[PDB]
Design a protein around this ligand. Structure first.
Ligand SMILES: Nc1ncnc2c1ncn2[C@@H]1O[C@H](CSCC[C@H](N)C(=O)O)[C@@H](O)[C@H]1O
Ligand SMILES: [Cl-]
Ligand SMILES: [Cl-]
Ligand code: NA
Ligand code: NA
Ligand SMILES: [Zn+2]
Ligand SMILES: [Zn+2]
Lengths: 299, 129
RNA sequence: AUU
C-alpha cells in the first residue's frame, strides 16, 4: 500500500505463516524494475541500510563486545559494501568478522576467504548475517527444490555456534532457499521474511530469526513455509522505495549492554527462556574469539 | 638486507598512482559511499561517518590504495589508518577518494584535513561572551 | 543475488 513506502521494507504478515500453500512460480508485478538510489550510493549499501533500519525495531540482544559474523560479504567490485554498513550500524568495539568465496577488501576486524564450509570457530556468535547466493542458482534454473550448498553449513552453524538469545538475517530468493533453514526459524522466539523497499522488485528476502531458544517452539514444514512466502510475494506487490535512506538520524543500533551468562543446558528453565525472548539475555562463554579458514593442501 | 634495499627503489604505489592520474588514467572506482545525516563533526578519519554539509563519508578500506591494490602498507607494523574507519572527503574531491587520502595529511591537533577544515593556523579571534 |  502507500504508508509502506516510508518504511525500510515489509515483513511477511503472520497470517501467511499459518497457511498451507502449494509451491508455484514467484511472479512479481514490478520484476526487474530499479528504485532511485541517492547519488553515488551502491545498491548493497541501500539494501543493508534498510535491513539494519528494520533490525532496529526488533528485540536484538546487544551486549558489550558483541560478536557478529557476516557471510557472503564480497562482491564482483572487490569491496564489502554490506560490511561497511554493518560496521556503521553496530556499536564501536563490536567484533565484526566477514567471509566470502572470493577475495575482497573489508572494514571487518577479520576477513576469511574460501567456501563457508571451510570456516571454523570455537566461539559462539550474537548475530549471523548472510548475503550468500550461488551463481549456479540463476544461470541454470531447475525444479524449485530445497538447496543444500552453503545452506546446510548455515543450518549447522546456527545449531552449534549461535548463542542463546542471538539472532540471524539470512538472504533467500525464490530459488535460493532451504527447508531446514525455515524449520530452524521455529527455534527462535520470533521470525519473519523481510523485503527491503529498495529491492522489492526481487524475490529476495532476509529470513530473520530473533532470539535463538536452542529448541523448537514451533514445528515448521520448510517446503510449505517457502510456498507461503511465495504466495505473500505474489499477492502483495511492494512499491520500490528509497525514502527510508534519506533519514539516518536514528540509524545506529542502541548499545543495550545485554547480560552475557555461561549457564549450562540444565539451568535453562522457563524463566531464562522468557528473558531470551525479550532480548534481555545472551547465553555463551566469553572466551577469546578464534576463527580460521581451512586450506586444501595438494601439489 | 638487499631485498628491502631494492623495494625502497622499485615498487612505489603512491608515485605510480599520482603519475597514473597525471597521464589521465581513470581514478580507482567502487569506493563505498555511506548514507549519513551530513551533520557530523567533519573530521578526516572517524569510527563512524562524520561528514558535514561539504563532505561525503566512505568506508576506510575501500579508499586505501594499499588495501585496494592488495600490497603492504608503507609503515613497519603494516597498520592501516583507514581500514575499519570512515574517511570524510570534500564533495569537490569525492570523484577520487583514494587520490585524496594519498595527497593530503590529517592534522594531529584538530583531526581535520590540512587545507580542508583545519583552522589551527588562522589568526587569533577576539574573545566572545 | 553483487541496481
Ligand atoms: N559457499 C559459499 N561460501 C562463501 N561465499 C559464498 C558461497 N556461495 C556464494 N558465496 C558468495 O555470496 C556472494 C553473493 S553477492 C554478495 C554481495 C555483498 N553482500 C555486498 O555487500 O555487496 C558472492 O560474493 C559469493 O562469492
Ligand atoms: Cl509493483
Ligand atoms: Cl542443492
Ligand atoms: Na558504529
Ligand atoms: Na534488483
Ligand atoms: Zn589500507
Ligand atoms: Zn588543525
Amino acid at each position: 500500500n502507500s504508508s509502506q513506502a516510508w518504511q525500510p521494507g515489509v515483513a511477511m504478515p503472520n497470517l501467511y505463516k499459518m497457511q498451507r500453500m502449494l509451491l508455484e512460480k514467484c511472479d512479481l508485478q514490478n520484476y526487474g524494475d530499479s528504485a532511485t538510489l541517492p547519488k553515488g550510493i551502491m545498491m548493497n549499501v541501500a539494501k543493508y541500510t534498510q535491513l539494519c533500519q528494520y533490525l532496529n525495531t526488533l528485540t536484538l540482544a546487544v551486549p558489550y563486545n558483541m560478536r557478529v559474523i557476516h557471510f557472503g560479504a564480497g562482491s564482483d567490485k572487490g569491496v564489502a559494501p554490506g560490511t561497511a554498513v554493518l560496521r556503521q550500524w553496530l556499536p564501536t568495539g563490536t567484533l565484526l568478522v566477514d567471509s566470502d568465496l572470493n577475495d575482497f577488501v573489508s572494514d571487518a576486524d577479520s576477513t576469511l576467504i574460501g567456501d563457508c564450509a571451510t570456516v571454523h570457530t570455537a566461539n559462539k556468535w550474537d548475530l549471523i548475517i548472510s548475503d550468500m547466493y550461488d551463481p549456479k542458482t540463476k544461470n541454470v534454473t531447475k525444479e524449485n527444490d530445497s538447496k543444500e550448498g552453503f545452506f546446510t553449513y548455515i543450518c549447522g552453524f546456527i545449531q552449534q555456534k549461535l548463542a542463546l538469545g542471538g539472532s540471524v538475517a539470512i538472504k533467500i530468493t525464490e530459488h535460493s532457499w532451504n527447508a531446514d533453514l525455515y524449520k530452524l526459524m521455529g527455534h527462535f522466539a520470533w521470525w519473519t521474511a523481510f523485503v527491503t523497499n529498495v529491492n522489492a522488485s526481487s524475490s529476495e528476502a532476509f529470513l530473520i530469526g530473533c532470539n535463538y531458544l536452542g529448541k523448537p517452539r514451533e514445528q515448521i514444514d520448510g517446503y510449505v513455509m517457502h510456498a507461503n512466502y511465495i504466495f505473500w510475494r505474489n499477492t502483495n506487490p511492494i512499491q520500490l522505495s528509497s525514502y527510508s535512506l534519506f533519514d539516518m538520524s536514528k540509524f545506529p543500533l542502541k548499545l543495550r549492554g545485554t547480560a552475557v551468562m555461561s549457564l549450562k543446558e540444565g539451568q535453562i528453565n522457563d524463566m531464562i527462556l522468557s528473558l531470551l525472548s525479550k532480548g534481555r539475555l545472551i547465553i555463551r562463554e566469553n572466551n577469546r574469539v578464534v576463527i580460521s579458514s581451512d586450506v586444501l593442501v595438494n601439489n | 638486507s638487499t631485498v628491502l634495499s631494492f623495494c625502497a627503489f622499485a615498487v612505489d604505489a603512491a608515485k605510480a598512482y599520482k603519475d597514473y592520474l597525471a597521464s589521465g588514467g581513470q581514478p580507482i572506482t567502487n569506493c563505498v559511499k555511506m548514507l549519513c545525516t551530513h551533520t557530523g563533526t567533519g573530521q578526516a578519519i572517524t569510527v563512524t561517518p562524520e561528514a558535514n554539509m561539504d563532505q561525503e563519508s566512505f568506508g576506510g578500506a575501500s579508499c586505501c590504495l594499499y588495501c585496494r591494490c592488495h600490497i603492504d602498507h608503507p609503515n613497519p607494523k603494516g597498520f592501516c589508518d583507514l581500514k575499519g574507519k570512515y574517511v570524510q572527503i570534500p564533495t569537490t574531491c569525492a570523484n577520487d577518494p583514494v587520490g585524496f587520502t594519498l595527497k593530503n595529511t590529517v592534522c594531529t591537533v584538530c583531526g581535520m584535513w590540512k587545507g580542508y577544515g583545519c583552522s589551527c593556523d588562522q589568526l587569533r579571534e577576539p574573545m566572545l561572551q
